[PDB]
Amino acid sequence: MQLNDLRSAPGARREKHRPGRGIGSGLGKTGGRGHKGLTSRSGGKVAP
């Protein structure tokens, strides 16, 4: 039990995904928003 020897259980922590970083990441360019439209823009939210 050292400070450089303890970690969390598998699956307890994930990494978050970052849109707009290259092609190989799978979330590049549009970043999961599809193409043009209201719900592809900054503040483009449909009211409840």
Provide the binding-site residues for RNA, judged by CB under 7 A: 18-26, 28-31, 36-38, 41, 43-44
Q: Binds 48, which of RNA, Mg ion, none (CB < 5 to 8 A, cut-off by type)?
A: none
Q: How far is the CB of 11 from RNA (least distance, A)?
A: 19
Residue numbers 1-48 binding Mg ion by CB under 5 A = 32, 34, 36-37, 42-43
Query: How many residues line the site for Mg ion (CB under 5 A)?
Result: 6
**DSSP character string of 11-38:** TS------SSS-STTS--TTTT--SSSG
Enter the DSSP assignment of 10: T
Distance CA 17, CA 33 (A): 14
